[PDB]
Design a protein around this motif. Structure first.
Motif, PDB file in Angstrom:
ATOM      1  N   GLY A 124      36.423  31.742  55.141  1.00  0.00           N
ATOM      2  CA  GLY A 124      35.946  33.742  54.181  1.00  0.00           C
ATOM      3  C   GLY A 124      35.954  34.238  56.242  1.00  0.00           C
ATOM      4  O   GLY A 124      35.455  34.907  55.431  1.00  0.00           O
ATOM      5  N   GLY A 131      38.847  35.787  56.560  1.00  0.00           N
ATOM      6  CA  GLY A 131      40.294  36.803  56.156  1.00  0.00           C
ATOM      7  C   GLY A 131      41.378  36.513  56.490  1.00  0.00           C
ATOM      8  O   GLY A 131      41.952  36.765  56.267  1.00  0.00           O
ATOM      9  N   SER A 184      42.912  33.358  55.363  1.00  0.00           N
ATOM     10  CA  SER A 184      43.119  32.811  53.446  1.00  0.00           C
ATOM     11  C   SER A 184      43.142  31.696  53.255  1.00  0.00           C
ATOM     12  O   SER A 184      43.932  30.501  53.308  1.00  0.00           O
ATOM     13  CB  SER A 184      44.902  33.287  53.666  1.00  0.00           C
ATOM     14  OG  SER A 184      44.997  32.467  52.481  1.00  0.00           O
ATOM     15  N   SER A 185      41.454  31.735  53.545  1.00  0.00           N
ATOM     16  CA  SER A 185      41.199  30.149  53.889  1.00  0.00           C
ATOM     17  C   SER A 185      41.013  29.475  52.154  1.00  0.00           C
ATOM     18  O   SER A 185      42.192  28.260  52.006  1.00  0.00           O
ATOM     19  CB  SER A 185      39.810  29.955  53.842  1.00  0.00           C
ATOM     20  OG  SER A 185      38.894  30.241  54.463  1.00  0.00           O
TER      21      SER A 185
HETATM   22 CL   LIG Z   1      39.728  33.684  53.844  1.00  0.00          CL
END
Ligand SMILES: [Cl-]
Length: 346
Positions: A99, A101, A103-104
């Motif tokens: 999380g 940012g 792109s998990s």
């Molecule tokens: Cl993420």
């Protein structure tokens, strides 16, 4: 038993343009979601991050509102796309921060898809992988994202960024400068406003009678309502910036690339209004400490920012800013030095 390494991603320039089919320029990064798995009758996965096992029968693709839904989405899209696959049992780990940012979700979704592709010999082509992962995220998970994240995680190439026309899906690899590092700064701040921006942008295209923001000039903006005009003006300026960064990179003009990223950041912050003081703090300090340029990356309102810096100064700049940042904000911020890497694979 196979092992898959699915990278995360960083968008260099071209933010909030993919939902109007504009230009984007992401890269896969050397932080990954790792999956080790083998065939099984059902789906059993142990998550190192959550420190727990979650499982489901192949017969059960019901949403459970947990990380397992990302796995279910891939099984759902494969079935929906006329593929027959069986279960898997394995472990999910890796160093891509959850999380932050980077792109998990796409990293994980594409990783699961690749795992199934290899174990069941689906022989999926790269574009199909992107489309399936996007459809899973959009229709199953329920998040209205563009194609940016999925494209980067699959198509990334070491030492290169990807210039992508999201309307035609035509793309090209652009070399990233040798000793220039991407300093990633996660603010420590883990949707609604995204949806709003997306709806307004879509209405704007219809008002202008265009199918892509690429086909819109600044002059035409006067025909849009005030609010629509404010937001769409940013999109038009951003598309133009992506093309400028493309040219600058092709000439190795990192100084110009940096200036454009900075201009883009303040456009996002002041006109698109998707930044926050934590992100702005990092950008300003990174610039004072020598960065060629800096900009938030991803959706905004938290998450991470990036700074283009000399490789030899990356650690020192990150360390100095983090110390200043932790005295100002209460979040568990972190910094990482990343490089453009290959897409999902071994
Ligand atoms: Cl993420």
């Amino acid at each position: 038993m196979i092992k898959v390494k699915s990278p995360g991603r960083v968008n260099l320039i071209g933010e909030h343009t993919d939902y109007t089919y504009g230009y984007v320029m992401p890269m896969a990064i050397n932080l990954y979601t790792k999956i080790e798995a083998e065939k099984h009758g059902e789906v059993i996965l142990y998550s190192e991050h959550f420190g727990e096992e979650r499982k489901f029968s192949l017969n059960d693709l019901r949403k459970e509102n947990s990380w397992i839904d990302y796995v279910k989405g891939i099984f759902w899209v494969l079935k929906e796309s006329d593929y027959e696959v069986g279960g898997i049992k394995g472990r999910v780990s890796g160093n891509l921060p959850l999380g932050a940012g980077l792109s998990s979700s796409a990293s994980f979704e594409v990783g699961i898809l690749e795992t199934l592709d290899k174990l069941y010999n689906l022989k999926l082509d790269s574009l199909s992988k992107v489309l399936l992962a996007k459809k899973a995220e959009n229709e199953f998970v329920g998040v209205p994202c563009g194609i940016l994240d999925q494209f980067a995680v699959v198509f990334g190439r070491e030492g290169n960024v990807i210039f992508l026309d999201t309307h035609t899906l035509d793309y090209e690899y652009i070399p990233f400068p040798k000793d220039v590092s991407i300093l990633v700064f996660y603010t420590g701040v883990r949707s609604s406003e995204y949806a709003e921006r997306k709806h307004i942008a879509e209405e704007s295209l219809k008002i202008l009678g265009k199918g892509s923001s690429k086909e819109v000039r600044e002059g035409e903006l006067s025909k849009l309502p005030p609010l629509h005009r404010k937001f769409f003006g940013y999109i038009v300026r951003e598309n133009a910036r992506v093309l400028e960064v493309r040219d600058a990179l092709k000439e190795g003009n990192v100084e110009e690339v940096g200036k454009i990223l900075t201009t883009a950041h303040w456009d996002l912050a002041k006109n698109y209004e998707v930044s926050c003081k934590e992100l702005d703090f990092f950008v300003e300090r990174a610039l004072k400490l020598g960065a060629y340029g800096a900009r938030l990356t991803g959706a905004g309102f938290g998450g991470s920012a990036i700074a283009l810096v000399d490789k030899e100064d990356a650690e020192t700049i990150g360390e100095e800013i983090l110390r200043e940042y932790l005295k100002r904000f209460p979040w568990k911020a972190r910094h990482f030095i990343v490089e453009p890497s290959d897409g999902v694979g071994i």
